[PDB]
Amino acid sequence: MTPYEDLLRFVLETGTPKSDRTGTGTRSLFGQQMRYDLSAGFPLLTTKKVHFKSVAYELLWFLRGDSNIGWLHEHGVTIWDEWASDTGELGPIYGVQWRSWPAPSGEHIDQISAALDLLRTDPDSRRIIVSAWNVGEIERMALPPCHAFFQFYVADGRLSCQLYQRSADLFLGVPFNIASYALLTHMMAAQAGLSVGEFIWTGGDCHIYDNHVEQVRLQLSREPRPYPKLLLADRDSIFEYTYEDIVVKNYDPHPAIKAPV
Amino acid sequence: MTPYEDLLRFVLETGTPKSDRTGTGTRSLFGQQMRYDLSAGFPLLTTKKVHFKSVAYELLWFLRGDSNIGWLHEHGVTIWDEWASDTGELGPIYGVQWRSWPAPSGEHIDQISAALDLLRTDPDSRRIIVSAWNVGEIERMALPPCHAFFQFYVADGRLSCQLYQRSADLFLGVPFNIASYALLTHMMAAQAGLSVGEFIWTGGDCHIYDNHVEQVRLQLSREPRPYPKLLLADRDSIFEYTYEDIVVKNYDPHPAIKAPV
Numbered sequence: 001m002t003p004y005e006d007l008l009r010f011v012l013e014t015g016t017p018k019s020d021r022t023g024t025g026t027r028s029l030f031g032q033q034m035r036y037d038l039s040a041g042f043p044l045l046t047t048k049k050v051h052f053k054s055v056a057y058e059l060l061w062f063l064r065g066d067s068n069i070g071w072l073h074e075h076g077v078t079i080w081d082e083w084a085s086d087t088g089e090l091g092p093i094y095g096v097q098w099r100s101w102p103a104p105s106g107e108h109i110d111q112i113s114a115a116l117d118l119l120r121t122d123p124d125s126r127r128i129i130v131s132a133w134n135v136g137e138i139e140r141m142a143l144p145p146c147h148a149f150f151q152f153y154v155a156d157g158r159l160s161c162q163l164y165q166r167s168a169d170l171f172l173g174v175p176f177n178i179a180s181y182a183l184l185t186h187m188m189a190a191q192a193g194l195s196v197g198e199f200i201w202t203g204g205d206c207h208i209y210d211n212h213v214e215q216v217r218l219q220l221s222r223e224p225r226p227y228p229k230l231l232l233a234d235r236d237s238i239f240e241y242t243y244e245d246i247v248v249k250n251y252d253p254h255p256a257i258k259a260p261v
Numbered sequence: 262m263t264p265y266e267d268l269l270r271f272v273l274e275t276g277t278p279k280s281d282r283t284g285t286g287t288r289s290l291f292g293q294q295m296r297y298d299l300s301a302g303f304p305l306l307t308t309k310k311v312h313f314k315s316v317a318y319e320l321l322w323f324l325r326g327d328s329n330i331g332w333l334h335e336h337g338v339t340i341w342d343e344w345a346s347d348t349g350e351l352g353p354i355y356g357v358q359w360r361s362w363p364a365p366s367g368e369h370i371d372q373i374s375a376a377l378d379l380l381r382t383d384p385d386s387r388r389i390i391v392s393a394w395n396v397g398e399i400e401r402m403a404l405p406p407c408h409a410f411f412q413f414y415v416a417d418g419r420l421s422c423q424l425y426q427r428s429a430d431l432f433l434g435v436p437f438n439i440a441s442y443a444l445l446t447h448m449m450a451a452q453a454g455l456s457v458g459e460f461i462w463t464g465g466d467c468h469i470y471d472n473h474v475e476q477v478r479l480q481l482s483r484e485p486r487p488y489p490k491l492l493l494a495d496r497d498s499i500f501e502y503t504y505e506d507i508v509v510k511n512y513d514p515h516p517a518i519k520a521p522v
């Protein structure tokens with residue numbers, strides 16, 4: 001099962017050429033979908049070595065509800081550095097919205113706690129939603145959210161998660177996004193007393209940048225290997241997980257493929 | 262091409278039995294997709310008669326930005342009456358968020374105009390989004406938004422739209438939802454000087470209500486007929502469309518199937 005490589009190949013082969021905000025140029029398709037059965041393995045890609053350390057810390061960073069790169073920086077993760085101000089600020093991005101979405105009333109809404117609370121007390125709910133798409137605050141963000149909106153689902157004790165990603169840099173960002181949300185689903189499941197089901201990735205603008213074509217063709221020439229296995233130490237709260245509470249067992253990827261400068 | 266009936270059949274056959282809010286009981290799948298090529302035909306189902314008039318007035322009502330069933334009632338449409346207050350108020354639902362999302366600055370954001378603007382001046386944008394999922398105002402709503410979040414995409418002068426529908430009553434709601442978004446996509450296309458492309462329907466919790474099983478089987482037993490054609494009169498503004506402007510040519514459906522008591 002290689003949902004990601006399948007999609008990458010599909011877009012490489014049938015994507016429409018298309019200009020963009022960065023001026024780099026892309027090939028693109030709209031409304032494409034991936035499904036991983038998380039009970040079958042953790043979807044950290046094996047066709048190139050993915051820097052999980054940065055994935056994990058970025059997610060922990062989101063869960064803290066930080067808007068400033070400082071903490072990410074202290075753990076050696078520089079993926080957000082370009083976009084920060086000189087004081088480190090990114091604006092009310094992902095984590096700020098996840099943890100403290102400002103309602104007109106002056107209350108800040110912790111969507112992550114709310115979601116977990118629903119998984120525990122009313123798992124059949126069709127409203128277990130977290131949205132980072134705060135129409136009123138987009139303009140103050142350094143970048144509008146790419147992974148914008150996500151929903152949980154429970155069936156026979158198993159937790160599934162679907163993410164709507166409006167904009168999908170397939171080579172660079174997407175491998176991070178998949179691992180991030182699979183990790184999140186594990187954490188949420190652990191905290192809710194559920195086992196993991198499916199992760200469904202639904203994308204809007206799914207693109208390959210014109211300057212990643214060689215890197216992509218190389219990746220598609222590689223034979224996929226067994227997915228690794230995710231383990232988590234026990235914690236009282238999702239907000240108490242640390243990097244050290246996470247282990248990825250039997251991760252055996254093909255070599256890393258550097259992003260073009 | 263029958264994405265709706267296929268999905269309907271698929272949930273009936275392989276969906277998991279599942280309790281719900283209304284107490285009715287459902288059979289359910291998570292994360293299912295339908296695609297329609299809008300250039301091939303207007304996806305008003307033919308396997309049963311769909312009250313398009315209700316569909317069109319509802320959409321015009323959203324576009325007006327109304328929170329009160331009034332304008333709808335006056336036009337012989339009753340689908341929201343049951344959820345309204347004594348004053349006929351639904352709180353800040355679809356239309357209010359579409360036309361006037363409250364930002365923390367006090368400003369009110371007309372998402373419909375902002376999307377149209379992007380379609381006209383920056384059609385390559387990957388940020389052409391409209392969201393009804395306003396976390397801070399959900400509690401004030403009669404019902405949380407089902408069709409929650411949608412995005413536009415342009416390629417080769419062709420406009421596509423993807424809808425994220427967090428919750429979908431497959432028998433009753435979804436046939437309206439499909440028509441409604443296909444209709445809006447035509448309006449946006451005309452207003453931006455684009456032709457129509459794909460409507461992609463992405464669902465969260467997709468369910469058949471226990472009390473709809475017999476009606477579902479009837480619908481599945483019928484052979485589909487050609488889709489009708491949408492004919493939209495010229496207007497210089499999306500907000501100036503009227504019901505009279507909206508014509509459905511050659512709609513030849515099987516008989517209506519009433520929603521059981």
Ligand SMILES: Cc1nc(=O)c2cc(CN(C)c3ccc(C(=O)N[C@@H](CCC(=O)O)C(=O)O)s3)ccc2[nH]1
Binds near residue numbers: 051078083174258
């Ligand atoms: C065009 C574009 N594509 C992106 O994926 C993107 C991602 C972020 C933040 N983010 C979500 C990122 C996820 C992965 C990144 C990247 O640098 N990947 C290297 C990792 C190098 C390292 O940290 O060891 C790699 O995977 O090759 S950056 C900000 C602007 C963007 N702009």
Ligand SMILES: Cc1nc(=O)c2cc(CN(C)c3ccc(C(=O)N[C@@H](CCC(=O)O)C(=O)O)s3)ccc2[nH]1
Binds near residue numbers: 283404437
């Ligand atoms: C459990 C549930 N299922 C729904 O489909 C639903 C729909 C609305 C509002 N709305 C989005 C509706 C779309 C279609 C409707 C329905 O009654 N249709 C009948 C004809 C009624 C009419 O034409 O006025 C039909 O389709 O057979 S109602 C509010 C709460 C709900 N609650």
Ligand SMILES: O=c1ccn([C@H]2C[C@H](O)[C@@H](COP(=O)(O)O)O2)c(=O)[nH]1
Binds near residue numbers: 147387
């Ligand atoms: O977590 C992320 C953050 C950014 N991007 C990519 C998608 C786009 O190529 C670009 C964002 O730019 P716009 O879509 O807003 O133009 O970065 C991702 O794929 N995942």
Ligand SMILES: O=c1ccn([C@H]2C[C@H](O)[C@@H](COP(=O)(O)O)O2)c(=O)[nH]1
Binds near residue numbers: 405431434435
């Ligand atoms: O345009 C709409 C409005 C409502 N619903 C259905 C979905 C659910 O069955 C119900 C809403 O109930 P909850 O998902 O919030 O429990 O109404 C739709 O299918 N389409």
